[PDB]
Amino acid sequence: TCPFYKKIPGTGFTVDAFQYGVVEGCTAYFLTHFHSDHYAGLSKHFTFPVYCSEITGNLLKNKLHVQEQYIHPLPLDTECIVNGVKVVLLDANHCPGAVMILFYLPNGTVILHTGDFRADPSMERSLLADQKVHMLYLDTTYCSPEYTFPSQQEVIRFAINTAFEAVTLNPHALVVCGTYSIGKEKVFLAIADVLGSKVGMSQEKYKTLQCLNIPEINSLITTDMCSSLVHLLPMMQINFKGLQSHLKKCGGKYNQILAFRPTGWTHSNKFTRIADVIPQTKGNISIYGIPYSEHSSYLEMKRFVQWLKPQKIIPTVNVGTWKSRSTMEKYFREWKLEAGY
Numbered sequence: 628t629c630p631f632y633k634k635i636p637g638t639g640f641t642v643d644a645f646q647y648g649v650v651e652g653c654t655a656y657f658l659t660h661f662h663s664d665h666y667a668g669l670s671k672h673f674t675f676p677v678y679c680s681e682i683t684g685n686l687l688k689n690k691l692h693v694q695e696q697y698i699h700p701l702p703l704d705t706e707c708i709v710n711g712v713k714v715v716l717l718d719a720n721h722c723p724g725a726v727m728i729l730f731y732l733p734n735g736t737v738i739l740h741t742g743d744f745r746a747d748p749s750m751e752r753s754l755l756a757d758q759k760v761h762m763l764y765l766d767t768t769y770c771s772p773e774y775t776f777p778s779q780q781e782v783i784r785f786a787i788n789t790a791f792e793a794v795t796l797n798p799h800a801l802v803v804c805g806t807y808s809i810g811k812e813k814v815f816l817a818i819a820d821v822l823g824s825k826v827g828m829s830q831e832k833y834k835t836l837q838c839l840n841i842p843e844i845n846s847l848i849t850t851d852m853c854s855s856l857v858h859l860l861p862m863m864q865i866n867f868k869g870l871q872s873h874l875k876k877c878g879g880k881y882n883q884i885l886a887f888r889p890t891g892w893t894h895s896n897k898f899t900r901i902a903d904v905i906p907q908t909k910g911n912i913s914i915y916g917i918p919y920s921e922h923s924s925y926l927e928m929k930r931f932v933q934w935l936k937p938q939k940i941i942p943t944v945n946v947g948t949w950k951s952r953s954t955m956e957k958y959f960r961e962w963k964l965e966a967g968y
């Protein structure tokens with residue numbers, strides 16, 4: 628049964644609620660983004676209207692085979708009427724196709740559902756500038772002050788400079804990057820651009836990327852592994868055993884691997900600056916963990932909420948323990964007392 632924080636009151640709508648069977652009273656199912664914990668339950672046998680971005684709808688049709696007659700893509704930044712209710716989709720600064728949803732309820736209440744997001748000051752100049760929000764359904768993934776990490780731009784600078792130095796020192800080094808979902812494509816795209824290479828990958832991953840409306844993508848990626856010196860592999864293979872095994876398959880073209888694991892936050896962020904990050908090494912294999920986040924830091928989250936000044940917050944992440952719920956409620960009250968709303 629569908630939990631309360633996935634239902635939008637005063638509407639027939641749910642958000643990211645496909646794993647509960649037929650939800651009583653639901654006339655339209657919204658999907659914020661194509662990540663498995665959020666789409667859990669969708670397939671070619673789904674027969675209710677799904678509302679989403681264009682990129683999410685391309686993934687639903689090609690990867691999950693949802694029939695076309697049930698996919699309702701909406702443009703961004705544009706007032707739309709759905710089942711008698713005004714809605715707007717906004718860019719979430721998460722993975723490709725990820726949105727936040729503004730709902731203008733028939734009684735005058737305004738709700739913002741962030742989906743998953745990485746808050747940014749640019750959101751202060753979206754269509755949010757113009758009006759009051761009563762209720763905020765908030766991605767609270769990193770809602771505690773210990774969660775610090777650098778800007779995506781600083782992380783990419785470190786990656787590009789590391790890869791270029793290594794391959795210039797040894798033209799026979801291969802670069803490998805891990806992945807297990809959409810998101811974080813700038814990591815492997817930026818490294819391949821500095822090296823003058825396309826990115827090589829499986830047919831299954833190439834198919835996924837072809838759904839994402841990335842400009843000039845045909846110029847940037849390939850299934851011909853032999854033509855490429857930046858390879859994508861499943862995240863599970865980014866370990867000394869899996870990398871050794873991969874290097875064997877490359878027919879003596881290469882004699883070294885440099886590999887990247889984009890994670891979110893890790894407790895080494897408590898101590899080490901991005902500039903000082905070092906790899907784990909075994910023989911001719913080095914592995915870097917890089918803190919590339921597609922979720923708000925604590926400070927970015929706090930800035931957004933103190934600007935928006937919502938009357939009520941409903942967290943959508945870390946909701947399963949009393950300790951997590953009490954910690955988040957304490958920070959929401961701090962924020963409200965500090966800013967005066």
Ligand code: NI
Nearest residue numbers: 660662721743
């Ligand atoms: Ni996500």
